[PDB]
Amino acid sequence: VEHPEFLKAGKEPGLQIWRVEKFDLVPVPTNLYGDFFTGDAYVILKTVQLRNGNLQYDLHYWLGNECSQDESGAAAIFTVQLDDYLNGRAVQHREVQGFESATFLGYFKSGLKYKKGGVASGF
Amino acid sequence: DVQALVIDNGSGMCKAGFAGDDAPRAVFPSIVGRPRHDSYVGDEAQSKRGILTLKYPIEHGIVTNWDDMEKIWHHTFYNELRVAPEEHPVLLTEAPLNPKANREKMTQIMFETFNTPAMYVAIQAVLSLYASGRTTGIVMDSGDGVSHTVPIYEGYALPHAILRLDLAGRDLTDYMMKILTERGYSFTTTAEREIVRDIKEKLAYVALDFEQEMATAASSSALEKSYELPDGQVITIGNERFRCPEALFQPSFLGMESAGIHETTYNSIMKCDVDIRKDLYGNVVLSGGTTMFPGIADRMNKELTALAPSTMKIKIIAPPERKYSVWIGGSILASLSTFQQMWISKEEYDESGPSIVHRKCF
Ligand SMILES: Nc1ncnc2c1ncn2[C@@H]1O[C@H](COP(=O)(O)OP(=O)(O)OP(=O)(O)O)[C@@H](O)[C@H]1O
Ligand SMILES: [Ca+2]
């Protein structure tokens, strides 16, 4: 299911972050990477370059403490879709606010920050 | 822009609605009624049972009568949802391991009979997992006639590890009827069975320790509750409150040789790659009407904790809205901006026929 943002996903080594906004996957402005609204859900793709030339992928869907069911449900589904689009090469990780993995937390050089708020539910 | 519909075909209750809504607009009995001596569907058929013979076209989540199923779908579109089906993409749910032939038939009916512009079939348990915000976990889906244990990894169910307990809500309602007799109470007619159902849904609970709970009910009247029948009479329920749902864990109560739901879950987990079992134990999602008993999550936690190594972190997820988890999950999926790609279109159906369902819907 090729979505415009999927066409951009995992092209080069690096980090990509999208926020779930009303049943759609919206990119987060690169200057806001690391600043997570606790009322939202996000999808993070971490592309790492492999010797052979191909890339390694890790898909993390981050769930804010107050995100609505539609947002967390969509983040999970978009994560399955992105993985499928990337030929099933991504390892998927569920990241809950306050309980993120060392790996995920490590993607943010100056440490990630939480901020109250977010976009309204899509229901 | 197009509005998709979502229909979850339960064996006892059908849930229908519009993608984007947080709850189904219509919930009604999956019954088709015909003159005992045209037809009716849902609540009306149930009401007119005095003059109609009722039929349930869905058994254990599997459709057994396609003419009746069509009647139910026709009714759902025109009467319950008040839509013209040829104007809406339709997402339908199916039981895990739905026979290949049935998937094609459901597909054929939607396109040929109802002329849906697009359609999609999703496994019930997978929709529930999605609704819980997870791509990996094991779902324990218990509704009317069966309880399924469905291990899912990274968005996809593991067919080889899917198991089932042929015991669910209707069996527990049946059991309550029976054990209530030993107390003296007699419930045998339909309206009476509805009372027993209400008693099960309002006063039953799963005890954390059954033997200790029975001892408590026997040596005290502390666990007793009073129920008021619609005919003024006030009856008294004792250990039947927990003995009823205890059947899920002890199927022998219903003379079944099968293992309780905690063991079925464990067994399904043990059939999966050892590398992913940790993720299943840590994400046991309960869904379905029969998982609504108070205390069931604590009991599932205790039983699973007892079967798995003490190192294993057991987590039971039992959302308050779990009766509609499957439907909510479908509403979300159908609402995604990427859903328009996933569905089977008329064009595709016309070109490939019913079998296209095996290539477009896992
Ligand atoms: N609070 C409750 N406590 C216990 N059981 C309940 C409660 N609410 C509903 N139920 C039971 O759940 C069952 C119906 O569940 P559900 O709607 O999930 O099934 P279904 O869709 O018709 O079945 P299936 O998924 O097997 O096809 C009935 O036996 C009903 O009595
Ligand atoms: Ca939000």
Side-chain angles (χ1 to χ4, degrees), chain A residues 19-22 37-41 66-68 70-71 117-122:
Chain A
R19 177 174 62 164
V20 165
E21 293 172 21
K22 256 113 185 210
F37 272 122
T38 63
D40 285 345
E66 304 93 29
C67 71
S68 42
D70 58 297
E71 285 169 339
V119 49
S121 176

Tab-separated table of all heavy atoms in Angstrom, chain A residues 19-22 37-41 66-68 70-71 117-122, ligand 2:
chain	number	residue	atom	x	y	z
A	19	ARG	N	3.936	11.636	12.551
A	19	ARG	CA	2.955	11.614	13.615
A	19	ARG	C	1.628	11.153	12.996
A	19	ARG	O	1.324	11.464	11.836
A	19	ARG	CB	2.773	12.997	14.219
A	19	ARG	CG	1.698	13.006	15.279
A	19	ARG	CD	1.604	14.335	15.998
A	19	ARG	NE	1.247	15.433	15.101
A	19	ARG	CZ	0.810	16.624	15.510
A	19	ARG	NH1	0.665	16.886	16.806
A	19	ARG	NH2	0.553	17.568	14.615
A	20	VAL	N	0.855	10.392	13.759
A	20	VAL	CA	-0.449	9.948	13.268
A	20	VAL	C	-1.382	11.155	13.410
A	20	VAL	O	-1.543	11.717	14.495
A	20	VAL	CB	-0.998	8.756	14.097
A	20	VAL	CG1	-2.491	8.560	13.825
A	20	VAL	CG2	-0.269	7.507	13.736
A	21	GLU	N	-1.980	11.584	12.312
A	21	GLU	CA	-2.892	12.708	12.388
A	21	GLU	C	-4.166	12.391	11.612
A	21	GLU	O	-4.173	12.356	10.377
A	21	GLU	CB	-2.215	13.972	11.849
A	21	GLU	CG	-1.068	14.434	12.731
A	21	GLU	CD	-0.275	15.567	12.123
A	21	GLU	OE1	-0.838	16.252	11.245
A	21	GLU	OE2	0.899	15.775	12.518
A	22	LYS	N	-5.227	12.122	12.370
A	22	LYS	CA	-6.535	11.799	11.816
A	22	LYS	C	-6.495	10.712	10.752
A	22	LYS	O	-6.854	10.930	9.595
A	22	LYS	CB	-7.175	13.065	11.265
A	22	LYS	CG	-8.253	13.605	12.185
A	22	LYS	CD	-7.895	14.936	12.815
A	22	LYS	CE	-8.975	15.350	13.818
A	22	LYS	NZ	-9.109	16.824	13.923
A	37	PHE	N	4.420	14.869	21.629
A	37	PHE	CA	3.180	15.281	22.292
A	37	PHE	C	2.676	14.006	22.973
A	37	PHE	O	2.521	12.971	22.319
A	37	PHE	CB	2.143	15.722	21.261
A	37	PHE	CG	2.228	17.170	20.880
A	37	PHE	CD1	2.415	17.537	19.558
A	37	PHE	CD2	2.068	18.162	21.830
A	37	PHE	CE1	2.438	18.879	19.177
A	37	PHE	CE2	2.089	19.508	21.464
A	37	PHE	CZ	2.274	19.867	20.129
A	38	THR	N	2.417	14.064	24.272
A	38	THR	CA	1.942	12.882	24.989
A	38	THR	C	0.485	12.498	24.647
A	38	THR	O	-0.004	11.445	25.052
A	38	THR	CB	2.081	13.078	26.524
A	38	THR	OG1	1.258	14.170	26.955
A	38	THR	CG2	3.551	13.377	26.888
A	39	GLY	N	-0.196	13.355	23.898
A	39	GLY	CA	-1.564	13.067	23.522
A	39	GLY	C	-1.606	12.477	22.130
A	39	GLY	O	-2.688	12.253	21.588
A	40	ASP	N	-0.431	12.200	21.560
A	40	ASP	CA	-0.332	11.648	20.208
A	40	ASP	C	0.416	10.330	20.099
A	40	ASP	O	0.987	9.838	21.072
A	40	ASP	CB	0.349	12.651	19.291
A	40	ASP	CG	-0.553	13.800	18.922
A	40	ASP	OD1	-1.770	13.691	19.140
A	40	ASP	OD2	-0.051	14.819	18.413
A	41	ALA	N	0.397	9.775	18.883
A	41	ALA	CA	1.081	8.528	18.544
A	41	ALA	C	1.972	8.849	17.335
A	41	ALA	O	1.594	9.642	16.464
A	41	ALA	CB	0.078	7.423	18.191
A	66	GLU	N	-1.740	9.913	26.644
A	66	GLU	CA	-3.109	10.346	26.369
A	66	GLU	C	-3.555	10.221	24.911
A	66	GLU	O	-4.583	10.777	24.538
A	66	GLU	CB	-3.315	11.796	26.840
A	66	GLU	CG	-2.991	12.039	28.313
A	66	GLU	CD	-1.553	12.508	28.523
A	66	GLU	OE1	-1.002	13.148	27.599
A	66	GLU	OE2	-0.969	12.238	29.600
A	67	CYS	N	-2.816	9.500	24.077
A	67	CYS	CA	-3.249	9.378	22.684
A	67	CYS	C	-4.542	8.561	22.641
A	67	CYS	O	-4.753	7.676	23.472
A	67	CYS	CB	-2.154	8.742	21.804
A	67	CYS	SG	-1.803	6.984	22.013
A	68	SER	N	-5.422	8.881	21.697
A	68	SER	CA	-6.713	8.181	21.586
A	68	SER	C	-6.570	6.828	20.879
A	68	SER	O	-5.586	6.576	20.189
A	68	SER	CB	-7.717	9.069	20.847
A	68	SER	OG	-7.107	9.705	19.735
A	70	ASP	N	-7.804	5.552	18.236
A	70	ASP	CA	-7.605	5.615	16.794
A	70	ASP	C	-6.144	5.900	16.422
A	70	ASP	O	-5.640	5.413	15.404
A	70	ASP	CB	-8.505	6.694	16.173
A	70	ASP	CG	-8.278	8.084	16.758
A	70	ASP	OD1	-8.510	8.294	17.968
A	70	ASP	OD2	-7.892	8.984	15.988
A	71	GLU	N	-5.490	6.717	17.250
A	71	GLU	CA	-4.093	7.099	17.040
A	71	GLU	C	-3.131	5.961	17.316
A	71	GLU	O	-2.278	5.691	16.476
A	71	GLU	CB	-3.766	8.307	17.898
A	71	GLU	CG	-4.364	9.559	17.311
A	71	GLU	CD	-4.290	10.733	18.241
A	71	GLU	OE1	-4.149	10.512	19.468
A	71	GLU	OE2	-4.379	11.880	17.744
A	117	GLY	N	-0.365	17.673	25.216
A	117	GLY	CA	-1.097	18.084	24.032
A	117	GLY	C	-0.992	17.172	22.824
A	117	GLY	O	-0.454	16.066	22.907
A	118	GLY	N	-1.514	17.654	21.696
A	118	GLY	CA	-1.484	16.905	20.452
A	118	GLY	C	-2.671	17.205	19.554
A	118	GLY	O	-3.518	18.031	19.893
A	119	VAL	N	-2.733	16.542	18.404
A	119	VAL	CA	-3.842	16.737	17.468
A	119	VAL	C	-5.078	15.963	17.964
A	119	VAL	O	-4.956	14.956	18.657
A	119	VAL	CB	-3.441	16.272	16.049
A	119	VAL	CG1	-2.826	14.883	16.116
A	119	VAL	CG2	-4.646	16.294	15.124
A	120	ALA	N	-6.269	16.445	17.632
A	120	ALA	CA	-7.505	15.789	18.072
A	120	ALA	C	-7.724	14.393	17.477
A	120	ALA	O	-7.225	14.075	16.397
A	120	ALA	CB	-8.698	16.673	17.733
A	121	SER	N	-8.490	13.572	18.188
A	121	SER	CA	-8.785	12.226	17.715
A	121	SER	C	-9.467	12.272	16.356
A	121	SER	O	-10.135	13.247	16.015
A	121	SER	CB	-9.706	11.502	18.698
A	121	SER	OG	-10.071	10.234	18.186
A	122	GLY	N	-9.287	11.210	15.581
A	122	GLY	CA	-9.921	11.131	14.281
A	122	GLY	C	-11.337	10.528	14.329
A	122	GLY	O	-12.055	10.583	13.329
C	2	CA	CA	-3.999	13.064	19.843
